Design a protein around this ligand. Structure first.
Ligand SMILES: CCC1=C(C)/C(=C/C2=NC(=C\c3[nH]c(/C=C4\NC(=O)[C@H](C)[C@H]4CC)c(C)c3CCC(=O)O)/C(CCC(=O)O)=C2C)NC1=O
Ligand SMILES: CCC1=C(C)/C(=C/C2=NC(=C\c3[nH]c(/C=C4\NC(=O)[C@H](C)[C@H]4CC)c(C)c3CCC(=O)O)/C(CCC(=O)O)=C2C)NC1=O
Ligand SMILES: CCC1=C(C)/C(=C/C2=NC(=C\c3[nH]c(/C=C4\NC(=O)[C@H](C)[C@H]4CC)c(C)c3CCC(=O)O)/C(CCC(=O)O)=C2C)NC1=O
Ligand SMILES: CCC1=C(C)/C(=C/C2=NC(=C\c3[nH]c(/C=C4\NC(=O)[C@H](C)[C@H]4CC)c(C)c3CCC(=O)O)/C(CCC(=O)O)=C2C)NC1=O
Ligand SMILES: CCC1=C(C)/C(=C/C2=NC(=C\c3[nH]c(/C=C4\NC(=O)[C@H](C)[C@H]4CC)c(C)c3CCC(=O)O)/C(CCC(=O)O)=C2C)NC1=O
Ligand SMILES: CCC1=C(C)/C(=C/C2=NC(=C\c3[nH]c(/C=C4\NC(=O)[C@H](C)[C@H]4CC)c(C)c3CCC(=O)O)/C(CCC(=O)O)=C2C)NC1=O
Ligand SMILES: CCC1=C(C)/C(=C/C2=NC(=C\c3[nH]c(/C=C4\NC(=O)[C@H](C)[C@H]4CC)c(C)c3CCC(=O)O)/C(CCC(=O)O)=C2C)NC1=O
Ligand SMILES: CCC1=C(C)/C(=C/C2=NC(=C\c3[nH]c(/C=C4\NC(=O)[C@H](C)[C@H]4CC)c(C)c3CCC(=O)O)/C(CCC(=O)O)=C2C)NC1=O
Lengths: 48, 161, 160, 49, 161, 161, 160, 161, 160, 160, 161
């Protein structure tokens, strides 16, 4: 039996693809549950 | 077969790579949609019979297909056809849970086009039976899950044509 | 570092390092594992030295967290405690470098002009910086507490 | 190729050598080398016309 | 310029990171080799003139370079060339003490390739003058320091070619 | 430099013409707006520091620009940036008094684009700092002077882009 | 070979071989032992022939082996003689085949594109081949030296 | 083939949708990167031959591949291989201009894997030849264009493996 | 697009794009935001354009909505305006592509044969298409109205 | 020119030109005044550009002015700079027209065959052209220097 | 082909001359009329069909030419004749844009006189068809462009006679 391949990358699917956009937003953009002084001196980028 | 998660693991295994940031992002994109996939499967499973009934009613019966000379003439063939319909529905539900179409190739599409050519089974009519079940499914499962269920019905139908 | 300062003098006089300059690099590097260890105590307690500093600072001068005060309010205070976190960080850098090059370029050269613009009261800030010495120093052995203390007193020195 | 490169004088310009850690041999002669103005006997008679 | 202690600070400052374990390990890796760097510098400095003399003797003079038509013909140009040699030796000694090549870029290599093209100064011949001084240096400084001195001579020479 | 009045004098001098009706009309058009220019300059000068503060607050700080990796990170560079801002404000006030942009070219724009490219200074961000000071200025100086002040801020900002 | 060439022309015109084609196969095969001897002699002296071609080459073009030369250095020269060894081999093949089919597919069709990429000066490769002719030819009888010489001059021709 | 502007039209045409806001946003995302694509193509085109030369030098020649028994042995096959390399470079430049990989499928990848299996052409070695040209390209085209050029080389190479 | 039309010329001659070809891609893409605005305006008024086109059409030729007319009745009319909606859509596609490739494959090649079969009167249809120009053009600035107008006149041209 | 190129493509299709093609020509007309000016500027400094190009070339590639070099000697060097003068001239032509057109017919089509015959190393001619870019470009404003630079890089490209 | 601008470039290229003052004056004389040429072409192109119709009506049809025995008798030949007319109009529009008649020689006149003699096509009648299209064109394009369009119609017509 010939082995099949895959023609749709799995992160191009709708549910997964939109949960990845949301994942980005949260880490970069925003703060948390630790004291504000610690969050106010953070660099979003890391090496640039 | 493979799912979202094993698709990634095997793609990295052949390169012998530990999972990196790009991989981890893909897996998150699956996990984050997971609860919704489960709810959608429970709706489809529990409405299975009604989906087939409404899909056949819109796209198959009341027609030449069911009247002497037609491929779903005889109780014998009518039963085989809605049996098939149940396969499609059931496997599409697997593909959508897995978030990967590979099972639809391995266990449903492989050789099926020619099997249908050999028996005389009308391909175009079968596709309409698939796209009618999709229509019903998309109503029942709601905004959350509609697009995700839909794609594996579309995978099935471009696999035959 | 000591190097950045110990080489700049060499190059400026167009020459190789002196026996003296070589000796201090020697003595300095021997004190490495240990200096690294004094800067690890301080990162452990990074947010706790800072919180404690904040309190001492406002007893000795509260007016800054009052109607017409530069640090009045929750987010005008978040910024203030954040500046105290900045300077503690720079102090850990200085201790591991063995001089101020890094501390200086990052947070004292230009600091008068920055704070004058913000009309943060700078001299209150020196007292705030001093408070951190008191807390940090109580988490270090006598010998390590002194070695740390020099870098705190430097910032206090510059700052004003 | 070592020999060709090395083991051989090769062609640079012309000419070579006599220098550090150093030198080459084809002998020499003190009153051997011909003086440069350089030449002949009978050039003299024959030179003119 | 920057040195190993300073580079660690500016590399972290741009990320706004406290020095952490990885940083502290790098700085240790410098401090632990520091005494050896100093001893090596004292050997080079005090043998400066002999290193240039032996390096020129193996790689420059007794040649077409020092003859009419050659770039180190004339006492003027011979003086300029061994003057240069002293720069290289001296700065490489700085780079090796600092444990960072950044000074070799800022104060030696920047524009030098084109400066030499513009004057006609032979690049390949200058590299040999660098790699001959390295050879001498590596003998004089011993096992302790040989590899560490050597790299900044190699930095210099791939900076021209 | 030149102002409204010397712009006209030099334009006629090169033709060796006594001032004629067209010239005299231009000069009137300047003199007739003169008192308003003076009042506007006194508002800008006396609010200088507040204009910079409000312009930086709307267009520069609370951002990646002031964070590590940003060009106005470090007290040194923050000071250099608001120093620049003061130049712009001050010279625009000169241009507006003179009723001629020539001083903005001679003493501010010439070479500045490349100076900023060479240091890495973000041009687009600097323009926003200019157009924010204009916004503040136009409120403070009132109907009389708003359009006239504004143009020399716009001259500055299209001089960089 | 002579065989391949004759046949290909025969088959392409849908016909049996001509009297001419048959004659040349006969004359060719009669020279078999001689052609095999010519290849043997040259195979037997291959290392010498490359060494003397390589000397003749570097005198005539000391530049190729100079700062900006394709063959400058010990291992850029080693590969250069290896290429000279390649072409001598192909020349022995050609001599025993009685034409160039083999020589051509193996080492001239595509050779411009190969060497242009490597930036090798083609005409100095042609010189290296002339140099090999001179050496090889001095190890063969007059008659055999000419027969060999045609194949050397072909390669020289094709690099053109 | 299709390009970003064309794909947006055919993707909407099959749904019979006017271009709407989402479509218009996609097209903007292409147009806004367009000038940079052009500059990058002019660098690649004009350095074509040098890119192949440096890519072959790092990833193909000086090896068993170019020796007897190797697939790029013989001037014939060496020529065929760098001929191929030029195709890849040239088409990747098309894909990057178009901002769509569809041309790489239609005119390069289709059947190529099996063509190479049938001739014996080493696939892994060809991928390295692709990823070496990418490396060179990314240096030559600069920050502006590096990521965008790179992806279509990566498209090519996962198309073979 | 301009790209599709032009690259095709590149590939067919086995070559990279010309300076000319590169220049036109650059000038074309610079004219992008404007073309996108022209499509937006028209997309935004599609229902008005179609309806007012449909009135303008039936005055200039009513007979089609009469006893023996192809568009006689409510659902025979629901189809004629739908076809007018189709062509306006294709016109927005053409404007953003900067040529007709898409417009052509979707709705002119085969259109004679389609409409001849339906015995829709095609030439009335050209006038109907022309009416849409008049409406659409009144919702666009002079410069944008002309740019749009070329694509309307193309469709009018192709139905001929 | 831009005109010739546009028209030739038009006529081949046997249809009048387009109305966005009436865009490249319009751009070229505005560009032409600037383009004419750049060519004049280049023409003024021709002797300096050639001479300084020639020094930059012989440093970077001294082998061409060496015993076995194509440009070895005073009059083999004189002809070499004359060829550099030729190509600078063609570059001014290309800039002014707005399309490379005439330069191709004058100095690249046939150039491989010409120089192969003369045995001139083509890639070092490409270097001589880069050298001219560097000089010419230092006598032009940033914007004009780029516009000129495209035509220099074309010639460099065509000798390849 | 050549236009105004390439006519000058090639005339100087054969002398190997940089463009001088006389050349630069010629090119200006072209550029300065350029915008008007473009407007005129847009009028001709967009009225193409009407110009042919009015030119045929004044100079060809309602005659023995269209009657049995006439060369534009039969729908075949009538179609060929107005096809020709479109060529003339279209190419004259090219010549006028280029500001050079060379294209009318290269792609229209060369061999055409004898081609018409060989088929029997009446030359004098064709010239009238050209000079009637000129008449119409000169009305439509206006004062700006009338003389410039006209000359290339006159070039065409003295090319046949
Ligand atoms: C020759 C073999 C054969 C049979 C028997 C057959 C039956 C058959 N009965 C049907 C419907 C039907 N059949 C019935 C029959 C009944 N309703 C009742 O309550 C009674 C119990 C019963 C009458 C005695 C009804 C009411 C429908 C319509 C059901 C629907 O449309 O949902 C249909 C779908 C309509 C159609 O497309 O024709 C088929 C195919 N088809 C076949 O090929
Ligand atoms: C590493 C070198 C460095 C430092 C130190 C630095 C400080 C700095 N402090 C800021 C604000 C601030 N800083 C403070 C600090 C204080 N308020 C008080 O009254 C106290 C005296 C003090 C706390 C001890 C406050 C209240 C603000 C907010 C002011 C405003 O938003 O107007 C801002 C603007 C907000 C931002 O965009 O981050 C900067 C850049 N930036 C730097 O690059
Ligand atoms: C035209 C300007 C000019 C001068 C003068 C010059 C001199 C010069 N003398 C040299 C060596 C030398 N020169 C001498 C000369 C002497 N030994 C003695 O004891 C005596 C005091 C003296 C003879 C009167 C010796 C012995 C060497 C060899 C030194 C060595 O190889 O270490 C060398 C190195 C060898 C070489 O590469 O040529 C140079 C360049 N170069 C120049 O460009
Ligand atoms: C602080 C860092 C620094 C360096 C390294 C430096 C190099 C340097 N070498 C120079 C010249 C030179 N450099 C050399 C060097 C050599 N000649 C040879 O044949 C050999 C290959 C080589 C010696 C190994 C010569 C001969 C000149 C003189 C060129 C002339 O006559 O103008 C000049 C021109 C100005 C002058 O003549 O002093 C500079 C600036 N300048 C600097 O500021
Ligand atoms: C049997 C058919 C055949 C030939 C001939 C062949 C030649 C060949 N010559 C090569 C390199 C080379 N060949 C030369 C040859 C020369 N340099 C000069 O200047 C002279 C003109 C010339 C010697 C006479 C040099 C110098 C290189 C190294 C070039 C480089 O590495 O960039 C290489 C790349 C290195 C390798 O991977 O082997 C190949 C494949 N390959 C083949 O399959
Ligand atoms: C337009 C798109 C297109 C592509 C890409 C293409 C590839 C292609 N490569 C081929 C052969 C080949 N391809 C190679 C390639 C290589 N050899 C190696 O060792 C390396 C790994 C690799 C170069 C990096 C070689 C050596 C052959 C010759 C095989 C033979 O001898 O038959 C052939 C067989 C016909 C021929 O020999 O030309 C095709 C069609 N054809 C196309 O139409
Ligand atoms: C034997 C092949 C052949 C044919 C058929 C032919 C037709 C023909 N019809 C013409 C005009 C005409 N033909 C018509 C015909 C009609 N008007 C209508 O509306 C009806 C649809 C149609 C009548 C059924 C009209 C009205 C004109 C005058 C048009 C004008 O002058 O603009 C003319 C131009 C007048 C002339 O010079 O004769 C020709 C040549 N010529 C030929 O060589
Ligand atoms: C692109 C440039 C170009 C031109 C201009 C051109 C002209 C041209 N006109 C032709 C015939 C013709 N030309 C005409 C023209 C006319 N009949 C009249 O009575 C009038 C006087 C005149 C129209 C005003 C006619 C009637 C024929 C057909 C002759 C035949 O029946 O064979 C033919 C013979 C092939 C064919 O029939 O198409 C050519 C090539 N070909 C070209 O490639």
């Amino acid at each position: 039996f010939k082995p099949i391949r895959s023609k749709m990358d799995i992160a191009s699917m709708p549910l997964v693809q939109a949960a990845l956009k949301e994942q980005q937003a949260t880490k970069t953009a925003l703060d948390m549950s630790r004291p504000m002084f610690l969050e106010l001196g953070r660099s979003f980028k890391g090496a640039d | 077969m493979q799912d979202a998660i094993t698709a990634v693991i095997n793609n990295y295994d052949v390169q012998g790579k530990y999972l990196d940031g790009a991989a981890l992002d893909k897996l998150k994109a699956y996990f984050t949609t997971g609860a919704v996939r489960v709810r959608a499967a429970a709706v489809i499973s529990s409405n299975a019979t009604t989906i087939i009934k409404e899909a056949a009613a819109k796209a198959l019966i009341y027609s030449d297909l069911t009247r002497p000379g037609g491929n779903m003439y005889t109780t014998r063939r009518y039963a085989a056809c809605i049996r098939d319909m149940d396969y499609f529905l059931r496997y599409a539900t697997y593909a959508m849970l897995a978030g990967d179409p590979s099972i639809l190739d391995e266990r449903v599409l492989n050789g099926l086009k020619e099997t249908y050519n050999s028996l005389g089974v009308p391909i175009a009519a079968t596709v309409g039976g698939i796209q009618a079940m999709k229509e019903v499914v998309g109503g029942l499962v709601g905004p959350d899950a509609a697009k995700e269920a839909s794609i594996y019905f579309d995978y099935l139908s471009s696999g035959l044509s | 570092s000591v190097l950045t300062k110990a080489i700049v003098n060499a190059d400026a006089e167009a020459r190789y390092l002196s026996p003296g300059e070589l000796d201090r690099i020697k003595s300095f590097v021997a004190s490495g594992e240990r200096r690294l260890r004094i800067a690890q105590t301080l990162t452990e307690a990074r947010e706790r030295i800072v919180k404690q500093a904040g309190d001492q600072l406002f007893q000795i001068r509260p007016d800054v967290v009052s109607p017409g005060g530069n640090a009045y309010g929750e987010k005008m205070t978040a910024l203030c405690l954040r500046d105290l976190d900045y300077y503690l960080r720079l102090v850990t850098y200085g201790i591991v470098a063995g001089d101020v090059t890094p501390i200086e370029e990052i947070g004292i050269i230009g600091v008068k002009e920055m704070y004058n613009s913000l009309q943060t009261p700078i001299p209150a800030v020196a007292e705030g910086v001093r408070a951190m010495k008191n807390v940090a120093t109580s988490l270090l052995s006598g010998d390590d507490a002194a070695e740390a203390g020099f870098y705190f007193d430097y910032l206090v020195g510059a700052m004003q | 190729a070592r020999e060709l490169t090395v083991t051989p004088v090769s062609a640079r310009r012309t000419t070579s050598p006599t220098a550090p850690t150093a030198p080459a041999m084809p002998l020499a002669g003190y009153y051997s080398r011909p003086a440069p103005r350089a030449t002949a006997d009978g050039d003299a008679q024959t030179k003119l016309g």
